[PDB]
From Swiss-Prot, chain A:
Gene Ontology CC: one annotated term: nucleolar exosome (RNase complex)
Crosslinked positions (Glycyl lysine isopeptide (Lys-Gly) (interchain with G-Cter in SUMO2)): 113
Signal peptide segment: none
Protein name per the record: Exosome complex component RRP40
The protein's role, per its UniProt record: Non-catalytic component of the RNA exosome complex which has 3'->5' exoribonuclease activity and participates in a multitude of cellular RNA processing and degradation events. In the nucleus, the RNA exosome complex is involved in proper maturation of stable RNA species such as rRNA, snRNA and snoRNA, in the elimination of RNA processing by-products and non-coding 'pervasive' transcripts, such as antisense RNA species and promoter-upstream transcripts (PROMPTs), and of mRNAs with processing defects, thereby limiting or excluding their export to the cytoplasm.
GO molecular function annotation: 3'-5'-RNA exonuclease activity; RNA binding
The family this protein is said to belong to: Belongs to the RRP40 family.
Keyword hit for Transmembrane helix: no
Native source species: Homo sapiens (Human)
Major location (coarse): cytoplasm
Subunit structure: Component of the RNA exosome core complex (Exo-9), composed of EXOSC1, EXOSC2, EXOSC3, EXOSC4, EXOSC5, EXOSC6, EXOSC7, EXOSC8 and EXOSC9; within the complex interacts with EXOSC5 and EXOSC9. The catalytically inactive RNA exosome core complex (Exo-9) associates with the catalytic subunit EXOSC10/RRP6. Exo-9 may associate with DIS3 to form the nucleolar exosome complex, or DIS3L to form the cytoplasmic exosome complex. Exo-9 is formed by a hexameric base ring consisting of the heterodimers EXOSC4-EXOSC9, EXOSC5-EXOSC8 and EXOSC6-EXOSC7, and a cap ring consisting of EXOSC1, EXOSC2 and EXOSC3.
From Swiss-Prot, chain B:
Major location category of this protein: nucleus
Native organism taxonomy: Eukaryota, Metazoa, Chordata, Craniata, Vertebrata
Official protein name in the record: M-phase phosphoprotein 6
Family named by the database record: Belongs to the MPP6 family.
Cross-link (Glycyl lysine isopeptide (Lys-Gly) (interchain with G-Cter in SUMO2)): 61
The UniProt record lists the keyword Methyltransferase: no
Job of this protein: RNA-binding protein that associates with the RNA exosome complex. Involved in the 3'-processing of the 7S pre-RNA to the mature 5.8S rRNA and play a role in recruiting the RNA exosome complex to pre-rRNA; this function may include C1D.
Known partners and oligomeric status: Associates with the RNA exosome complex, mediated by EXOSC3. Interacts with ARHGAP18. Interacts with exosome cofactors EXOSC10 and MTREX.
Entry annotated with the keyword Zinc: no
GO biological process terms held by the UniProt record: maturation of 5.8S rRNA
GO molecular function: RNA binding
GO CC terms, sorted: cytosol; exosome (RNase complex); nucleolus; nucleoplasm; nucleus
Record's keyword terms, sorted: Cytoplasm, Isopeptide bond, Nucleus, Phosphoprotein, RNA-binding, rRNA processing, Ubl conjugation
Post-translational modification: Phosphorylated in M (mitotic) phase.
Curated annotation (Swiss-Prot), chain C:
Cellular component annotations (GO), alphabetically ordered: cytoplasm; cytoplasmic exosome (RNase complex); cytosol; exosome (RNase complex); nuclear exosome (RNase complex); nucleolar exosome (RNase complex); nucleolus; nucleoplasm
Keywords for this protein: Cytoplasm, Disease variant, Exosome, Neurodegeneration, Nucleus, Phosphoprotein, RNA-binding, rRNA processing
Function: Non-catalytic component of the RNA exosome complex which has 3'->5' exoribonuclease activity and participates in a multitude of cellular RNA processing and degradation events. In the nucleus, the RNA exosome complex is involved in proper maturation of stable RNA species such as rRNA, snRNA and snoRNA, in the elimination of RNA processing by-products and non-coding 'pervasive' transcripts, such as antisense RNA species and promoter-upstream transcripts (PROMPTs), and of mRNAs with processing defects, thereby limiting or excluding their export to the cytoplasm.
Keyword Cytoplasm: yes
Subcellular location: Nucleus, Nucleolus; Nucleus; Cytoplasm
Disease: Pontocerebellar hypoplasia 1F: A form of pontocerebellar hypoplasia, a disorder characterized by structural defects of the pons and cerebellum, evident upon brain imaging. PCH1F is an autosomal recessive form characterized by hypotonia, global developmental delay, poor overall growth, and dysmorphic facial features. Brain imaging shows pontocerebellar hypoplasia, thin corpus callosum, cerebral atrophy, and delayed myelination.
S1 motif domain sequence ranges: 62-143
Gene3D superfamilies named among the record's database cross-references: 2.40.50.100, Nucleic acid-binding proteins
GO BP: RNA catabolic process; RNA processing; rRNA processing
Protein name as it appears in the record: Exosome complex component CSL4
Domain of life: Eukaryota
Amino acid sequence: ARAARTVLGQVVLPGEELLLPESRVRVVCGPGLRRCGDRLLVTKCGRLRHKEPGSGSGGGVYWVDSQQKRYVPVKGDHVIGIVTAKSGDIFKVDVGGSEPASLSYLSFEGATKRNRPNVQVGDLIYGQFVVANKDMEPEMVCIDSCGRANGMGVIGQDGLLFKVTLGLIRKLLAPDCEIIQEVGKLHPLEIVFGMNGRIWVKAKTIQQTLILANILEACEHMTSDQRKQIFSRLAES
Amino acid sequence: RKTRLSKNLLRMKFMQRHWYLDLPELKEKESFIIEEQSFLLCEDLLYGRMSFRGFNPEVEKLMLQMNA
Amino acid sequence: VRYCIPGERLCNLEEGSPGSGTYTRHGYIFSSLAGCLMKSSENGALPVVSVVRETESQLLPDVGAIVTCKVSSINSRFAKVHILYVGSMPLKNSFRGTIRKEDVRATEKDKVEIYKSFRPGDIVLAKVISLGDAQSNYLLTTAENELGVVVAHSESGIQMVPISWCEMQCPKTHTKEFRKVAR
């Protein structure tokens, strides 16, 4: 109930109310926060964090960098999925949430009734949500709005799909990550990050793929010893 | 004589190719805080699908595109 | 006035005809419920006997009705509801109805969107069309500007006001939700 500005790098715990300065300037409530009147209730333990837009009118934005495993269907998020079944026109894909999301046979890039896509049960997908809400089952799509799959659609095959923490992704996808840059020097690869803690990787051989998956699932707290150990191993593969 | 086409031909496909209300209490008002649940507005992020020195150059041009 | 019983005869077929809550045996009618009987008379002089348990006598939401309901479940296709007030007389026998996608506005546009018209846990009023056959699924419609949502609670616990045709706002704080506001 004090000094939103003084705890922007401290550990807040649920229950805590924090209030912000001013007639006023519009702001936005992050994911792990909630609004009570003119105050901000905290709903998840976290190292609080703030940001401001390049302008001076936007005000600001607050949130909590909470680590966890379970995912919640959100809108405008790129997500890996696993087709669970097909009902007539729409086929249902798993995401890792409350309930399975739905696709449409004519959402993929360039598909119609006389041109259906090749989706088989068990096939994995890289889509994004267009209706993500607490009251309705989430529908997803594998095509930008303009009408082109800018990297979406079926993933492919001949790769490794594993699962990690969400904060790990939220960190790796940062433009200032060191591990995923250093890896671009030892051996080639191509990988999909899904914001639901689920990752897909491919390389030439398999030993490399395994070493890579281990690195990723450990890179949250790797020691320099283990770091250079697995780096040397990759250099020797 | 004639100068233009016909319609029966010109139809084919290879050719074609409430109310309101004024609340003085809440008329010119606007939300001051809004609930979001996206880590994107929160924080900037690169494009998921990427590649390093050769695998699927299509993803390389996608990287060049979406990451700026 | 006389209260009857599920076994006692009431009249010959020559002195009346079964209307409801009865049955027939050789040359006689026999009640089927514990309740009050009544023999209505047509201009034809042949009476129609019936038996009723006036506790919940009878109700029927007909086509050209105006019935309230509560939005429980929703989907990109339709939204299901429970019947509470048929007109103004409640009915503890809560019937279950449905509202389709296109049958939401008089304009009939496909551009309509449920999640921006309805939400689970708000009261509307609509006009039934189809009674239903197997499950008596009432199909309700809101193809009118004085129809739809009337009361709607906010993000968490506040009741909102119908500002405009597809806008609603809470009075304490400021936030513009989207519904198919009525009137």
